[PDB]
PDB file of C-alpha atoms and ligand atoms in Angstrom:
ATOM      1  CA  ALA G 283     105.188  51.694  74.110  1.00 48.96           C
ATOM      2  CA  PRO G 284     104.751  51.614  77.945  1.00 46.37           C
ATOM      3  CA  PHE G 285     104.945  54.614  80.286  1.00 44.69           C
ATOM      4  CA  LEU G 286     107.426  52.962  82.715  1.00 44.15           C
ATOM      5  CA  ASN G 287     111.084  53.094  81.657  1.00 45.65           C
ATOM      6  CA  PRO G 288     113.563  51.783  84.267  1.00 45.60           C
ATOM      7  CA  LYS G 289     116.300  54.141  82.930  1.00 44.84           C
ATOM      8  CA  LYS G 290     114.149  57.295  83.155  1.00 46.34           C
ATOM      9  CA  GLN G 291     112.320  59.599  85.586  1.00 47.37           C
ATOM     10  CA  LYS G 292     108.966  60.136  83.869  1.00 47.42           C
ATOM     11  CA  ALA G 293     106.647  62.974  84.800  1.00 47.36           C
ATOM     12  CA  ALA G 294     103.032  62.085  85.752  1.00 47.64           C
ATOM     13  CA  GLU G 295     100.363  64.730  86.324  1.00 48.58           C
ATOM     14  CA  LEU G 296      97.836  64.512  89.143  1.00 49.78           C
ATOM     15  CA  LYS G 297      94.333  64.157  87.583  1.00 49.41           C
ATOM     16  CA  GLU G 298      92.196  63.524  90.733  1.00 47.99           C
ATOM     17  CA  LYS G 299      92.803  63.425  94.499  1.00 47.18           C
ATOM     18  CA  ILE G 300      90.000  61.501  96.223  1.00 47.33           C
ATOM     19  CA  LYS G 301      89.635  60.847  99.967  1.00 48.11           C
ATOM     20  CA  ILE G 302      89.045  57.208 100.903  1.00 49.44           C
ATOM     21  CA  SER G 303      89.023  58.000 104.601  1.00 52.14           C
ATOM     22  CA  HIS G 304      90.299  60.787 106.927  1.00 51.25           C
ATOM     23  CA  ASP G 305      93.952  59.636 106.467  1.00 48.26           C
ATOM     24  CA  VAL G 306      93.843  57.546 103.234  1.00 47.50           C
ATOM     25  CA  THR G 307      93.846  59.293  99.838  1.00 48.25           C
ATOM     26  CA  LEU G 308      93.631  57.942  96.291  1.00 48.28           C
ATOM     27  CA  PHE G 309      95.865  59.858  93.855  1.00 47.56           C
ATOM     28  CA  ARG G 310      95.006  59.379  90.190  1.00 47.16           C
ATOM     29  CA  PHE G 311      98.002  60.183  87.988  1.00 52.43           C
ATOM     30  CA  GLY G 312      97.810  60.544  84.246  1.00 48.21           C
ATOM     31  CA  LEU G 313     100.258  58.853  81.877  1.00 49.69           C
ATOM     32  CA  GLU G 314     101.702  60.595  78.731  1.00 50.54           C
ATOM     33  CA  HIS G 315      98.361  59.990  76.930  1.00 53.62           C
ATOM     34  CA  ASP G 316      95.017  58.532  77.984  1.00 50.93           C
ATOM     35  CA  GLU G 317      95.486  55.214  76.037  1.00 54.69           C
ATOM     36  CA  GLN G 318      99.026  54.470  77.292  1.00 58.43           C
ATOM     37  CA  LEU G 319      99.997  51.132  78.809  1.00 57.70           C
ATOM     38  CA  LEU G 320     101.520  51.515  82.294  1.00 57.43           C
ATOM     39  CA  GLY G 321     104.071  48.715  81.735  1.00 57.57           C
ATOM     40  CA  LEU G 322     104.196  47.434  85.322  1.00 55.34           C
ATOM     41  CA  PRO G 323     104.622  43.623  85.483  1.00 55.52           C
ATOM     42  CA  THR G 324     102.776  41.775  88.283  1.00 57.05           C
ATOM     43  CA  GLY G 325     105.072  41.564  91.324  1.00 58.21           C
ATOM     44  CA  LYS G 326     106.835  44.867  90.529  1.00 57.39           C
ATOM     45  CA  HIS G 327     106.407  48.455  91.868  1.00 55.75           C
ATOM     46  CA  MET G 328     107.525  52.048  91.050  1.00 58.72           C
ATOM     47  CA  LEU G 329     109.573  54.767  92.710  1.00 56.05           C
ATOM     48  CA  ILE G 330     107.782  58.071  92.951  1.00 56.11           C
ATOM     49  CA  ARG G 331     109.636  61.299  93.658  1.00 57.41           C
ATOM     50  CA  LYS G 332     109.308  65.061  93.871  1.00 57.06           C
ATOM     51  CA  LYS G 333     111.701  67.989  94.303  1.00 58.57           C
ATOM     52  CA  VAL G 334     110.318  70.204  97.139  1.00 59.90           C
ATOM     53  CA  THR G 335     111.531  73.090  99.363  1.00 56.81           C
ATOM     54  CA  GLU G 336     115.241  68.423  98.410  1.00 57.57           C
ATOM     55  CA  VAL G 337     114.345  65.382  96.283  1.00 58.85           C
ATOM     56  CA  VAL G 338     112.115  62.919  98.238  1.00 60.86           C
ATOM     57  CA  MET G 339     111.410  59.427  96.842  1.00 59.00           C
ATOM     58  CA  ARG G 340     109.337  56.405  98.057  1.00 61.66           C
ATOM     59  CA  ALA G 341     108.221  53.044  96.611  1.00 62.36           C
ATOM     60  CA  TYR G 342     104.497  52.529  95.708  1.00 62.51           C
ATOM     61  CA  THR G 343     102.505  49.703  94.211  1.00 64.52           C
ATOM     62  CA  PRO G 344      99.509  51.297  92.451  1.00 63.98           C
ATOM     63  CA  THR G 345      96.058  49.775  92.958  1.00 66.34           C
ATOM     64  CA  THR G 346      95.741  49.692  89.141  1.00 69.70           C
ATOM     65  CA  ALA G 347      98.183  47.936  86.786  1.00 72.06           C
ATOM     66  CA  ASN G 348      98.430  47.123  83.001  1.00 71.96           C
ATOM     67  CA  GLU G 349      94.652  46.502  82.707  1.00 70.10           C
ATOM     68  CA  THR G 350      94.062  50.280  83.238  1.00 72.67           C
ATOM     69  CA  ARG G 351      95.302  52.490  80.400  1.00 76.40           C
ATOM     70  CA  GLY G 352      96.058  56.212  80.567  1.00 77.04           C
ATOM     71  CA  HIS G 353      96.427  56.521  84.349  1.00 81.66           C
ATOM     72  CA  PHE G 354      97.406  54.747  87.568  1.00 79.89           C
ATOM     73  CA  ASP G 355      95.891  55.039  91.022  1.00 84.29           C
ATOM     74  CA  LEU G 356      97.893  55.154  94.247  1.00 83.37           C
ATOM     75  CA  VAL G 357      96.198  54.455  97.575  1.00 82.60           C
ATOM     76  CA  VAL G 358      98.335  56.221 100.186  1.00 82.40           C
ATOM     77  CA  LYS G 359      98.188  56.231 103.993  1.00 83.84           C
ATOM     78  CA  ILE G 360      98.888  59.884 105.040  1.00 87.28           C
ATOM     79  CA  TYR G 361     101.175  60.073 108.097  1.00 85.75           C
ATOM     80  CA  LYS G 362     100.124  63.435 109.409  1.00 85.27           C
ATOM     81  CA  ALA G 363     102.173  65.666 111.693  1.00 85.36           C
ATOM     82  CA  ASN G 364     101.177  66.226 115.388  1.00 88.21           C
ATOM     83  CA  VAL G 365      98.974  63.076 115.582  1.00 88.32           C
ATOM     84  CA  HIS G 366     101.389  60.356 116.810  1.00 92.30           C
ATOM     85  CA  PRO G 367     103.584  61.323 119.859  1.00 87.58           C
ATOM     86  CA  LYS G 368     106.503  59.067 118.653  1.00 89.89           C
ATOM     87  CA  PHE G 369     106.364  60.732 115.180  1.00 91.21           C
ATOM     88  CA  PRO G 370     105.357  64.445 115.655  1.00 86.62           C
ATOM     89  CA  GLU G 371     106.766  65.420 112.212  1.00 90.49           C
ATOM     90  CA  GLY G 372     104.677  62.729 110.446  1.00 92.36           C
ATOM     91  CA  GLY G 373     105.686  61.045 107.188  1.00 92.78           C
ATOM     92  CA  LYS G 374     107.706  63.164 104.732  1.00 95.94           C
ATOM     93  CA  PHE G 375     106.497  61.935 101.294  1.00 98.71           C
ATOM     94  CA  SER G 376     102.884  60.968 102.216  1.00 98.84           C
ATOM     95  CA  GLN G 377     102.362  64.634 103.392  1.00100.39           C
ATOM     96  CA  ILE G 378     104.095  65.888 100.181  1.00 97.35           C
ATOM     97  CA  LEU G 379     101.578  63.809  98.151  1.00 95.95           C
ATOM     98  CA  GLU G 380      98.621  64.966 100.319  1.00 94.70           C
ATOM     99  CA  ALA G 381      99.680  68.624  99.749  1.00 91.78           C
ATOM    100  CA  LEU G 382      99.569  68.165  95.919  1.00 87.47           C
ATOM    101  CA  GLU G 383      96.875  69.939  93.930  1.00 90.18           C
ATOM    102  CA  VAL G 384      95.365  68.512  90.698  1.00 94.09           C
ATOM    103  CA  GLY G 385      97.696  69.594  87.884  1.00 93.78           C
ATOM    104  CA  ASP G 386     100.902  69.166  89.983  1.00 96.01           C
ATOM    105  CA  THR G 387     103.411  66.518  88.872  1.00 93.47           C
ATOM    106  CA  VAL G 388     105.635  63.778  90.322  1.00 92.84           C
ATOM    107  CA  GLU G 389     108.421  61.766  88.692  1.00 92.73           C
ATOM    108  CA  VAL G 390     108.039  58.032  88.238  1.00 90.04           C
ATOM    109  CA  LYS G 391     110.772  55.399  87.815  1.00 89.17           C
ATOM    110  CA  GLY G 392     110.098  51.724  87.225  1.00 90.34           C
ATOM    111  CA  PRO G 393     109.444  48.849  87.034  1.00 92.63           C
ATOM    112  CA  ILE G 394     111.312  47.890  90.186  1.00 92.74           C
ATOM    113  CA  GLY G 395     111.587  44.420  91.606  1.00 89.85           C
ATOM    114  CA  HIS G 396     112.981  40.902  91.326  1.00 88.91           C
ATOM    115  CA  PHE G 397     109.700  38.931  91.575  1.00 88.31           C
ATOM    116  CA  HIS G 398     107.509  38.612  88.462  1.00 91.30           C
ATOM    117  CA  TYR G 399     104.260  36.609  88.328  1.00 89.58           C
ATOM    118  CA  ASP G 400     104.509  36.451  84.510  1.00 88.25           C
ATOM    119  CA  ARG G 401     101.694  34.071  83.487  1.00 89.22           C
ATOM    120  CA  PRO G 402      98.950  32.012  85.188  1.00 90.41           C
ATOM    121  CA  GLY G 403     100.553  29.657  87.713  1.00 90.53           C
ATOM    122  CA  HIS G 404     104.162  30.772  87.063  1.00 89.18           C
ATOM    123  CA  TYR G 405     106.707  33.184  88.507  1.00 90.28           C
ATOM    124  CA  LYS G 406     110.310  34.361  88.134  1.00 90.95           C
ATOM    125  CA  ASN G 407     112.364  35.407  91.204  1.00 91.27           C
ATOM    126  CA  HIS G 408     115.689  36.988  90.137  1.00 90.32           C
ATOM    127  CA  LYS G 409     117.180  34.239  87.849  1.00 85.77           C
ATOM    128  CA  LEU G 410     114.968  31.373  89.200  1.00 87.26           C
ATOM    129  CA  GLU G 411     111.695  30.327  87.474  1.00 87.67           C
ATOM    130  CA  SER G 412     108.883  28.008  88.733  1.00 86.85           C
ATOM    131  CA  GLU G 413     105.295  26.837  88.465  1.00 88.59           C
ATOM    132  CA  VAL G 414     103.071  27.760  91.394  1.00 92.20           C
ATOM    133  CA  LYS G 415      99.646  26.462  92.517  1.00 91.24           C
ATOM    134  CA  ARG G 416      99.244  28.178  95.926  1.00 90.63           C
ATOM    135  CA  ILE G 417     100.427  31.552  97.236  1.00 89.66           C
ATOM    136  CA  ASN G 418     100.506  32.668 100.859  1.00 90.52           C
ATOM    137  CA  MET G 419     100.597  36.431 101.353  1.00 89.59           C
ATOM    138  CA  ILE G 420     101.620  38.172 104.531  1.00 91.50           C
ATOM    139  CA  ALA G 421     101.205  41.936 104.679  1.00 90.35           C
ATOM    140  CA  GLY G 422     101.604  44.569 107.358  1.00 92.76           C
ATOM    141  CA  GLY G 423     100.094  48.067 106.993  1.00 93.16           C
ATOM    142  CA  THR G 424     101.077  49.675 103.631  1.00 91.71           C
ATOM    143  CA  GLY G 425     102.631  46.301 102.645  1.00 90.76           C
ATOM    144  CA  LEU G 426      99.159  45.396 101.417  1.00 92.36           C
ATOM    145  CA  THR G 427      99.268  46.983  97.885  1.00 96.90           C
ATOM    146  CA  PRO G 428     102.006  44.592  96.489  1.00 98.40           C
ATOM    147  CA  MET G 429      99.694  41.700  97.657  1.00 98.89           C
ATOM    148  CA  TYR G 430      96.523  43.364  96.289  1.00 98.33           C
ATOM    149  CA  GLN G 431      98.163  43.753  92.821  1.00 97.27           C
ATOM    150  CA  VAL G 432      99.044  39.975  92.723  1.00 99.00           C
ATOM    151  CA  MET G 433      95.578  38.985  94.087  1.00101.23           C
ATOM    152  CA  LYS G 434      93.829  40.953  91.330  1.00101.66           C
ATOM    153  CA  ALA G 435      96.166  39.632  88.582  1.00 99.78           C
ATOM    154  CA  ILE G 436      95.309  36.046  89.662  1.00 99.06           C
ATOM    155  CA  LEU G 437      91.614  36.360  90.483  1.00100.53           C
ATOM    156  CA  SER G 438      90.594  38.550  87.508  1.00 99.15           C
ATOM    157  CA  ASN G 439      92.248  36.161  85.039  1.00 98.17           C
ATOM    158  CA  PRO G 440      89.661  33.718  83.539  1.00 99.54           C
ATOM    159  CA  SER G 441      92.417  31.044  82.975  1.00102.03           C
ATOM    160  CA  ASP G 442      94.325  31.136  86.306  1.00 99.88           C
ATOM    161  CA  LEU G 443      93.363  28.581  89.065  1.00100.19           C
ATOM    162  CA  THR G 444      96.082  29.598  91.582  1.00104.28           C
ATOM    163  CA  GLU G 445      94.764  29.688  95.194  1.00102.34           C
ATOM    164  CA  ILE G 446      95.643  32.458  97.668  1.00105.86           C
ATOM    165  CA  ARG G 447      95.737  32.900 101.439  1.00107.32           C
ATOM    166  CA  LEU G 448      96.217  36.384 102.841  1.00106.10           C
ATOM    167  CA  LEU G 449      97.217  37.208 106.411  1.00105.78           C
ATOM    168  CA  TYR G 450      97.019  40.972 107.008  1.00108.90           C
ATOM    169  CA  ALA G 451      98.402  42.568 110.196  1.00110.05           C
ATOM    170  CA  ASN G 452      97.775  46.164 111.384  1.00111.10           C
ATOM    171  CA  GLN G 453      98.013  48.131 114.619  1.00111.91           C
ATOM    172  CA  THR G 454      94.249  48.924 114.784  1.00115.22           C
ATOM    173  CA  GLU G 455      91.124  47.955 112.777  1.00114.21           C
ATOM    174  CA  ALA G 456      91.035  51.619 111.517  1.00113.23           C
ATOM    175  CA  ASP G 457      94.498  51.112 109.888  1.00113.25           C
ATOM    176  CA  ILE G 458      93.332  48.235 107.597  1.00110.55           C
ATOM    177  CA  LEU G 459      93.692  49.439 103.994  1.00110.26           C
ATOM    178  CA  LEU G 460      91.167  48.484 101.242  1.00112.33           C
ATOM    179  CA  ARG G 461      89.030  46.374 103.615  1.00113.33           C
ATOM    180  CA  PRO G 462      85.774  46.660 101.491  1.00110.37           C
ATOM    181  CA  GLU G 463      87.799  45.676  98.373  1.00110.05           C
ATOM    182  CA  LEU G 464      89.460  42.731 100.135  1.00113.08           C
ATOM    183  CA  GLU G 465      86.114  41.521 101.497  1.00108.42           C
ATOM    184  CA  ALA G 466      84.524  41.854  97.989  1.00104.62           C
ATOM    185  CA  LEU G 467      87.375  39.726  96.475  1.00105.64           C
ATOM    186  CA  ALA G 468      86.906  36.997  99.125  1.00107.46           C
ATOM    187  CA  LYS G 469      83.104  37.145  98.495  1.00105.23           C
ATOM    188  CA  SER G 470      83.425  36.951  94.670  1.00102.82           C
ATOM    189  CA  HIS G 471      86.130  34.137  94.560  1.00101.96           C
ATOM    190  CA  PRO G 472      85.202  32.098  97.714  1.00101.48           C
ATOM    191  CA  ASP G 473      86.915  28.873  96.678  1.00101.26           C
ATOM    192  CA  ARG G 474      90.151  30.581  95.509  1.00100.75           C
ATOM    193  CA  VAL G 475      90.998  33.005  98.332  1.00103.21           C
ATOM    194  CA  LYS G 476      90.726  33.417 102.118  1.00103.66           C
ATOM    195  CA  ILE G 477      91.648  36.552 104.041  1.00102.91           C
ATOM    196  CA  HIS G 478      92.486  36.679 107.767  1.00101.34           C
ATOM    197  CA  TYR G 479      93.251  39.799 109.814  1.00 99.42           C
ATOM    198  CA  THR G 480      95.077  40.576 113.073  1.00 99.34           C
ATOM    199  CA  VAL G 481      95.173  43.835 115.025  1.00 98.30           C
ATOM    200  CA  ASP G 482      97.405  44.713 118.049  1.00 98.09           C
ATOM    201  CA  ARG G 483      94.618  46.308 120.087  1.00 97.79           C
ATOM    202  CA  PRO G 484      91.163  44.981 119.110  1.00 97.53           C
ATOM    203  CA  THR G 485      87.613  46.321 119.825  1.00 97.85           C
ATOM    204  CA  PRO G 486      84.871  44.038 121.416  1.00 96.90           C
ATOM    205  CA  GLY G 487      83.077  43.280 118.104  1.00 93.58           C
ATOM    206  CA  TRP G 488      86.253  41.963 116.323  1.00 93.20           C
ATOM    207  CA  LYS G 489      85.803  38.566 114.564  1.00 92.61           C
ATOM    208  CA  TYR G 490      89.510  37.922 113.781  1.00 92.57           C
ATOM    209  CA  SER G 491      92.916  37.522 115.532  1.00 93.62           C
ATOM    210  CA  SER G 492      94.665  39.732 118.145  1.00 92.32           C
ATOM    211  CA  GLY G 493      98.351  40.488 118.716  1.00 95.95           C
ATOM    212  CA  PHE G 494     101.459  39.687 116.663  1.00 92.81           C
ATOM    213  CA  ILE G 495     101.606  37.053 113.908  1.00 96.33           C
ATOM    214  CA  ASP G 496     102.574  33.703 115.593  1.00 95.44           C
ATOM    215  CA  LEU G 497     102.791  30.026 114.491  1.00 92.46           C
ATOM    216  CA  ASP G 498      99.122  29.311 115.464  1.00 91.87           C
ATOM    217  CA  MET G 499      97.902  32.302 113.429  1.00 94.46           C
ATOM    218  CA  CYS G 500     100.046  31.271 110.399  1.00 92.36           C
ATOM    219  CA  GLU G 501      98.720  27.663 110.634  1.00 92.91           C
ATOM    220  CA  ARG G 502      95.093  28.862 110.819  1.00 93.17           C
ATOM    221  CA  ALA G 503      95.380  31.459 108.008  1.00 94.19           C
ATOM    222  CA  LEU G 504      97.959  30.044 105.577  1.00 90.27           C
ATOM    223  CA  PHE G 505      98.916  26.988 103.507  1.00 90.02           C
ATOM    224  CA  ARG G 506     101.723  24.716 104.786  1.00 90.94           C
ATOM    225  CA  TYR G 507     104.637  24.250 102.362  1.00 90.37           C
ATOM    226  CA  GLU G 508     104.269  21.610  99.583  1.00 91.49           C
ATOM    227  CA  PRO G 509     105.987  21.805  96.117  1.00 93.50           C
ATOM    228  CA  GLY G 510     104.049  24.462  94.207  1.00 92.82           C
ATOM    229  CA  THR G 511     103.345  26.637  97.331  1.00 94.34           C
ATOM    230  CA  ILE G 512     105.197  29.902  97.948  1.00 95.57           C
ATOM    231  CA  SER G 513     104.825  32.688 100.517  1.00 96.68           C
ATOM    232  CA  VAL G 514     105.271  36.372  99.610  1.00 98.70           C
ATOM    233  CA  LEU G 515     105.782  39.090 102.206  1.00 97.60           C
ATOM    234  CA  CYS G 516     105.625  42.845 102.518  1.00 95.37           C
ATOM    235  CA  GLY G 517     105.670  44.846 105.693  1.00 96.99           C
ATOM    236  CA  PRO G 518     107.811  46.563 108.334  1.00 98.46           C
ATOM    237  CA  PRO G 519     111.275  44.902 108.533  1.00 98.78           C
ATOM    238  CA  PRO G 520     110.894  43.786 112.257  1.00 98.72           C
ATOM    239  CA  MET G 521     107.500  42.108 111.546  1.00 98.63           C
ATOM    240  CA  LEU G 522     108.987  40.108 108.623  1.00 99.12           C
ATOM    241  CA  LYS G 523     112.276  39.070 110.245  1.00100.96           C
ATOM    242  CA  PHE G 524     110.931  38.285 113.736  1.00100.12           C
ATOM    243  CA  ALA G 525     107.213  37.359 113.382  1.00 99.34           C
ATOM    244  CA  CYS G 526     106.891  35.958 109.833  1.00 97.99           C
ATOM    245  CA  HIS G 527     110.001  34.112 108.577  1.00 95.65           C
ATOM    246  CA  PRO G 528     110.516  32.074 111.817  1.00 94.82           C
ATOM    247  CA  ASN G 529     106.905  30.784 111.636  1.00 92.97           C
ATOM    248  CA  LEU G 530     106.916  30.169 107.827  1.00 98.54           C
ATOM    249  CA  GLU G 531     110.247  28.289 108.290  1.00 97.50           C
ATOM    250  CA  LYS G 532     108.402  26.056 110.840  1.00 99.19           C
ATOM    251  CA  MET G 533     105.624  25.523 108.201  1.00100.93           C
ATOM    252  CA  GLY G 534     108.236  24.207 105.712  1.00102.57           C
ATOM    253  CA  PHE G 535     109.141  27.410 103.836  1.00 98.65           C
ATOM    254  CA  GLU G 536     112.702  28.575 102.996  1.00 99.40           C
ATOM    255  CA  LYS G 537     113.726  32.283 103.163  1.00100.16           C
ATOM    256  CA  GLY G 538     114.684  33.640  99.713  1.00100.73           C
ATOM    257  CA  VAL G 539     113.580  30.481  97.849  1.00 99.56           C
ATOM    258  CA  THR G 540     109.929  29.678  98.867  1.00 99.63           C
ATOM    259  CA  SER G 541     109.456  32.740 101.179  1.00 97.84           C
ATOM    260  CA  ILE G 542     109.987  35.859  99.012  1.00 98.22           C
ATOM    261  CA  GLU G 543     109.967  39.471 100.215  1.00 98.86           C
ATOM    262  CA  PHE G 544     108.770  42.390  98.103  1.00 99.76           C
TER     263      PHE G 544
HETATM  264  C1  FAD F 277     107.005  47.750  97.452  1.00 99.50           C
HETATM  265  C2  FAD F 277     106.386  48.843  98.287  1.00 99.50           C
HETATM  266  C3  FAD F 277     105.102  49.285  97.973  1.00 99.50           C
HETATM  267  C4  FAD F 277     104.474  50.278  98.739  1.00 99.50           C
HETATM  268  N1  FAD F 277     103.188  50.687  98.380  1.00 99.50           N
HETATM  269  C5  FAD F 277     102.600  51.595  99.122  1.00 99.50           C
HETATM  270  C6  FAD F 277     101.238  51.997  98.775  1.00 99.50           C
HETATM  271  O1  FAD F 277     100.638  51.631  97.784  1.00 99.50           O
HETATM  272  N2  FAD F 277     100.680  52.933  99.643  1.00 99.50           N
HETATM  273  C7  FAD F 277     101.317  53.499 100.759  1.00 99.50           C
HETATM  274  O2  FAD F 277     100.717  54.322 101.466  1.00 99.50           O
HETATM  275  N3  FAD F 277     102.605  53.137 101.058  1.00 99.50           N
HETATM  276  C8  FAD F 277     103.204  52.236 100.286  1.00 99.50           C
HETATM  277  N4  FAD F 277     104.487  51.840 100.605  1.00 99.50           N
HETATM  278  C9  FAD F 277     105.183  52.607 101.654  1.00 99.50           C
HETATM  279  C10 FAD F 277     105.873  53.861 101.113  1.00 99.50           C
HETATM  280  O3  FAD F 277     107.041  53.514 100.366  1.00 99.50           O
HETATM  281  C11 FAD F 277     106.269  54.841 102.217  1.00 99.50           C
HETATM  282  O4  FAD F 277     107.149  54.205 103.137  1.00 99.50           O
HETATM  283  C12 FAD F 277     105.085  55.486 102.942  1.00 99.50           C
HETATM  284  O5  FAD F 277     104.338  56.263 102.006  1.00 99.50           O
HETATM  285  C13 FAD F 277     105.494  56.368 104.106  1.00 99.50           C
HETATM  286  O6  FAD F 277     106.536  57.265 103.666  1.00 99.50           O
HETATM  287  P1  FAD F 277     106.670  58.754 104.263  1.00 99.50           P
HETATM  288  O7  FAD F 277     107.717  59.484 103.513  1.00 99.50           O
HETATM  289  O8  FAD F 277     105.313  59.406 104.365  1.00 99.50           O
HETATM  290  O9  FAD F 277     107.157  58.450 105.745  1.00 99.50           O
HETATM  291  P2  FAD F 277     108.626  58.579 106.360  1.00 99.50           P
HETATM  292  O10 FAD F 277     109.043  59.998 106.462  1.00 99.50           O
HETATM  293  O11 FAD F 277     109.519  57.721 105.494  1.00 99.50           O
HETATM  294  O12 FAD F 277     108.490  57.988 107.866  1.00 99.50           O
HETATM  295  C14 FAD F 277     109.004  56.675 108.176  1.00 99.50           C
HETATM  296  C15 FAD F 277     107.981  55.882 108.952  1.00 99.50           C
HETATM  297  O13 FAD F 277     107.574  56.592 110.143  1.00 99.50           O
HETATM  298  C16 FAD F 277     106.283  56.140 110.530  1.00 99.50           C
HETATM  299  N5  FAD F 277     105.444  57.298 110.841  1.00 99.50           N
HETATM  300  C17 FAD F 277     105.726  58.613 110.576  1.00 99.50           C
HETATM  301  N6  FAD F 277     104.778  59.447 110.933  1.00 99.50           N
HETATM  302  C18 FAD F 277     103.797  58.623 111.462  1.00 99.50           C
HETATM  303  C19 FAD F 277     102.504  58.883 111.965  1.00 99.50           C
HETATM  304  N7  FAD F 277     101.887  60.062 111.849  1.00 99.50           N
HETATM  305  N8  FAD F 277     101.794  57.839 112.449  1.00 99.50           N
HETATM  306  C20 FAD F 277     102.328  56.612 112.385  1.00 99.50           C
HETATM  307  N9  FAD F 277     103.511  56.240 111.884  1.00 99.50           N
HETATM  308  C21 FAD F 277     104.201  57.297 111.433  1.00 99.50           C
HETATM  309  C22 FAD F 277     105.743  55.244 109.397  1.00 99.50           C
HETATM  310  O14 FAD F 277     105.822  53.871 109.760  1.00 99.50           O
HETATM  311  C23 FAD F 277     106.672  55.593 108.231  1.00 99.50           C
HETATM  312  O15 FAD F 277     106.804  54.537 107.282  1.00 99.50           O
HETATM  313  C24 FAD F 277     105.149  50.821  99.851  1.00 99.50           C
HETATM  314  C25 FAD F 277     106.439  50.374 100.175  1.00 99.50           C
HETATM  315  C26 FAD F 277     107.072  49.403  99.401  1.00 99.50           C
HETATM  316  C27 FAD F 277     108.488  48.983  99.743  1.00 99.50           C
END
């Protein structure tokens, strides 16, 4: 019996809270028992909530999935107060999570989502089903973890030959999430995945792209459309609508059919 039940809010207890960097924390939440299946299909996420002094809820794709029993890990960017001048109050739920102590609980509802990569080289999107050979992934900031979950499900499977191209955009090089992990995946599956990065404001020793995602960047980093090739996207709404879809549409993709948003 899996932990996730889409009809229920299920309590999960914080087991470990481990700093990845000054503003990125890994939260390790226990399931009902240490051998329990999470029950999160590839392509889906969860809603995590807590009642504080007001019920606050946000979507998260854990960096672990069904392969890890008894717990799930969340990698969370903490949007701290009095750091950014445009956002002096910071992020509501990421600070709630950061303030948690081991032993505190959150409520979890899931699985959530319309896209399901259900078996090697195959997916379901709402009511539509199809074989797939190549997947483009475009992520911005925290939009990375839905991509990371799919990349691991494909690359760690000894019977899946699906190829991947990731294009990951962030404001600064310091904002890139899971960079060592992404680099280690590209290093350990060199003929199956490529990863390309862009930052708004780069430093002199930067070996990748600068500025917003454009047609040239999409053509360098991603596959063009052919039957069997899809593009999946997760990031800030303006980035997707204005920088991604127009350029994928020029590369032969179709919004909602071959270009799918998480
Ligand atoms: C499918 C899915 C999966 C996700 N997975 C993850 C994941 O694994 N990890 C993760 O960290 N997030 C993930 N997110 C994002 C998550 O849902 C939240 O939006 C995020 O945690 C921020 O919420 P918040 O309550 O802290 O910020 P809010 O209070 O909702 O603030 C709104 C926005 O203000 C901006 N902002 C506020 N303060 C600052 C600041 N100090 N500096 C810069 N910008 C600021 C941010 O862009 C923020 O998103 C995912 C989202 C989706 C839809």
